[PDB]
Design a binder for this molecule. Structure first.
Ligand SMILES: NC(=O)C1=CN([C@@H]2O[C@H](COP(=O)(O)OP(=O)(O)OC[C@H]3O[C@@H](n4cnc5c(N)ncnc54)[C@H](OP(=O)(O)O)[C@@H]3O)[C@@H](O)[C@H]2O)C=CC1
Ligand SMILES: NC(=O)C1=CN([C@@H]2O[C@H](COP(=O)(O)OP(=O)(O)OC[C@H]3O[C@@H](n4cnc5c(N)ncnc54)[C@H](OP(=O)(O)O)[C@@H]3O)[C@@H](O)[C@H]2O)C=CC1
Ligand SMILES: NC(=O)C1=CN([C@@H]2O[C@H](COP(=O)(O)OP(=O)(O)OC[C@H]3O[C@@H](n4cnc5c(N)ncnc54)[C@H](OP(=O)(O)O)[C@@H]3O)[C@@H](O)[C@H]2O)C=CC1
Ligand SMILES: NC(=O)C1=CN([C@@H]2O[C@H](COP(=O)(O)OP(=O)(O)OC[C@H]3O[C@@H](n4cnc5c(N)ncnc54)[C@H](OP(=O)(O)O)[C@@H]3O)[C@@H](O)[C@H]2O)C=CC1
Lengths: 245, 246, 245, 245
């Protein structure tokens, strides 16, 4: 129980990497505030974790809503007494060419992956400053490598990375650790949201013949980074499927 | 001599700084120029100046953050000038300050202009550039390559422009659309005037006062070099820094 | 005992990060082949590890010596059964300006940090292919970020990173995992070897206010990467002192 | 006549990019010192350049040879008055897998692409400081992008880039401009030297369909960078074939 007495807030906790991360942190003894739009999914996860002995705080939240973000951080601190770890995991991946793109793909991705992550970082920061806490940014291979049909997705993830390095420069001397996780292909619900049909199909075929990373693997990376001693900031973990060039 | 005789260039953020100098430089090469920004009075004055020297000019009152405005500005340009050969996505704002307790309207403004605006204008011009085997020039920054304190969101937008633009290159380069990314360091423009975080504005102005700054004309020459390169050559990145600045 | 039955070869095991990594891998049940130029220190470590229950194979080796490298890989396979993990940790950091540099600084760094690492990678590769093994490259923050007075050091580490990314592209499909660890300032013998006296003094001063990373912290990064499931390649871990902008 | 009265030293001037660069700089009014191993090609170029109105100094030089490098710099200042522009263009590209690689490929590449470039940079530096001159580093797409079967070539070019960024930090304030040119596929003699036959055939097929960059295009990039006003350092120009993803 490396995180006994600590409080973690995890966005995008209703499925995928966020769900596995909530579980992994709870297993380490952290109280978990789990946030997402699908209230029912969170309550189900919340019940499971509570039944296993965890302290859970359920938050219905859209990370793109600045005021909503402020209230979620406030609610977490009221219910759980503080904030030691923030996991900015809420995100969406809408693939397709730039040409003739559905620009709501773009505004959604920017709102959630970039602005939402920034809003939640800023709202949590005074609390993380007090606790000399850790912010974990869920980036991507797409924050490191550019491939076709992911231009705006990659823009947001390279943006998260730059935002996060700069944030590290700003707050690291005050003991706030900035951790950036960069998974490659992970078996989640992420790809089901792709709106460009031809691209959804190409992407599905591209990832069909690898062993994908598991959400649990990414959760383990988070666990490794957050349980490191305070004097160490694991600023980047870049984890790739072994099967994938 | 006129390396760009007969070509049509659309330059966003043309009312001052790098965009103004770029519009002038391209006009001097014989390009017809569509000049876009929000301060129409500035644009008209530039248009008049350019027209007086024998240039063909189309004035566009435009906010790049306005998706509908963008489509209309591209349509207006192709109708007035015949087509589109070069797009220069130069409109942008740099609002420095710490992340902690930031005025988040700094952020939404930078994302709307620097990132979404540039993407909207890229997307709108692209069918025309495909037809002309044209060139899109993205005005990034040293901030797209190097992270310094108090520029978190600005740097996010510029690293974003770079990733968007490399991906775009992969998608369109085989069809003959060249993607050029220009990355200036400190350049003597109006940019710094807009910083809203007072302490940071003063820190920034103090830092840059100690160096010979890049000139807007220097960045215009970089654009000129990239766009006049033979079609088979894509000058994908030009990173130009003040010599005086580590 | 995650590595029971596995064989690891660690270069630069006589002190610093290599010593701590050898210790950490042995503690997980790995047989360890320990390689360096100071046999007296290697023997003293080997004595301890065998005392704790590890099988140890001592290698007197200069990584710059191509034939020495081939021979060290061969005697390890004969002695320990095979090769599962390679840790290319041997390195030197000779800081100074480029202007009037002692160019023997440069040849030493290139021979050890770059060429030596490449030689050992090539020599181990057949055995790593057969075992679906892992190669861990000890890079640096100097492979990610450039600072003054470290030009050739940074050249070698950026070089290590490129070489290793390319290597991953070449061998990952056959199950050879390529891991790159990038430590910031770590409290080891490394800084003692700087031959430019004025730069040594400046560097010591630059790092004097922070809590440095410890060799054991970097060993833990290695342990985490190598104990990850086979389908996961932790290609990069960038670990920085929290105190250091 | 933008470079009238200036002195340029170009390494690898006997063919390819270096030959075109010498021609371009001479055309702008520079006195040119042209360095390579094939003296008979150099003398033939020197005659053309002299016939065109340029002052030429011919240097037989192996850039891997430190002594020879120091003598070439001295010879040039004696013959031509000083040194204003250095073009470190000498290079070789030896492609092939890392696995079972002919390691002489590696040592040749490091000696020439990395060490020789560093040697020449260091030797020229005193003179460039006095003249507030420009050093131009001939890197590659291989210093920005990693592809298969180019591991060690990429290591050298990423190394050049790190070295050169650091060099810039060390010398920029004293008026020495550091310019890095990064060409993609260019139609030169480079690919003829590949020793791994299978890779040579794959590479030549790979580039068989595109309009390649021309040596003259790269010379123009150099011309643009060095004729920029002194307050501007064109630190990187990354120039790719339009036809090539
Ligand atoms: N799977 C993969 O291959 C990779 C994923 N990633 C990153 O992992 C992160 C999580 O995605 P992943 O688990 O894969 O996919 P999932 O779709 O399974 O998870 C995304 C989570 O984010 C939540 N979410 C989406 N939008 C919002 C919003 N606006 N406000 C609050 N919550 C939101 C979703 O829940 P809800 O709808 O209930 O709000 C869901 O819980 C993303 O940042 C993604 O970019 C990175 C690299 C690889
Ligand atoms: N100056 C510097 O040190 C550097 C600048 N840059 C980049 O150069 C580009 C131009 O800035 P620069 O010349 O320096 O500074 P300026 O402020 O002088 O120019 C910015 C231009 O963009 C226009 N603009 C701003 N927002 C919008 C918008 N919403 N819609 C349409 N036009 C807009 C402005 O005119 P108007 O108000 O009339 O609309 C102005 O013409 C920016 O992208 C900036 O990031 C990059 C690196 C360094
Ligand atoms: N300490 C730090 O702040 C950082 C270190 N690193 C990297 O970690 C690695 C280890 O350095 P560190 O532990 O810090 O310092 P140490 O000096 O304590 O360790 C270096 C090890 O390498 C060995 N070595 C040196 N040259 C050779 C050679 N030619 N052949 C075989 N072994 C050799 C030394 O042993 P022996 O003399 O017996 O051969 C020693 O065991 C290096 O690659 C370094 O670049 C990376 C980032 C930060
Ligand atoms: N062609 C391409 O697709 C690209 C090339 N490059 C770079 O451009 C540079 C020039 O190569 P390129 O023109 O293409 O090919 P070439 O082979 O035509 O030119 C290489 C030049 O380097 C010289 N040279 C090689 N070794 C040495 C040495 N040991 N000492 C002194 N001179 C030497 C050769 O002359 P000699 O034999 O007479 O000594 C020759 O003149 C290289 O650094 C290469 O990495 C970068 C990107 C793309």
């Amino acid at each position: 129980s490396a995180l006994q007495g600590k409080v973690a807030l995890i966005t995008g906790a209703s499925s995928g990497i966020g769900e596995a991360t909530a579980r992994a942190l709870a297993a380490e003894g952290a109280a978990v505030a789990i946030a997402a739009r699908r209230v029912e999914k969170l309550r189900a996860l919340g019940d499971e974790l509570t039944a296993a002995g965890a302290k859970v705080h359920v938050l219905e939240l859209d990370v793109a809503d600045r005021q909503g973000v402020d209230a979620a951080v406030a609610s977490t601190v009221e219910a759980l007494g503080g904030l030691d770890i923030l996991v900015n995991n809420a995100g969406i991946m809408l693939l397709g060419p730039v040409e003739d793109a559905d620009t709501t793909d773009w505004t959604r991705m920017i709102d959630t992956n970039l602005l939402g992550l920034m809003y939640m970082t800023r709202a949590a920061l005074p609390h993380l400053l007090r606790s000399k806490g850790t912010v974990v940014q869920m980036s991507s291979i797409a924050g490191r490598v550019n491939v076709r049909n992911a231009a705006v997705y990659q823009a947001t993830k390279f943006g998260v990375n730059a935002f996060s390095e700069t944030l590290r420069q700003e707050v690291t001397e005050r003991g706030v650790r900035v951790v950036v996780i960069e998974p490659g292909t992970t078996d989640t619900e992420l790809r089901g949201h792709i709106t460009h049909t031809a691209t959804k199909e190409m992407y599905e075929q591209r990832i069909s013949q690898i062993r994908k990373l598991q959400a649990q693997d990414i959760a383990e990376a988070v666990r490794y980074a957050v349980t490191a001693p305070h004097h160490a900031t694991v600023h980047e973990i870049f984890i790739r499927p072994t099967d994938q060039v």
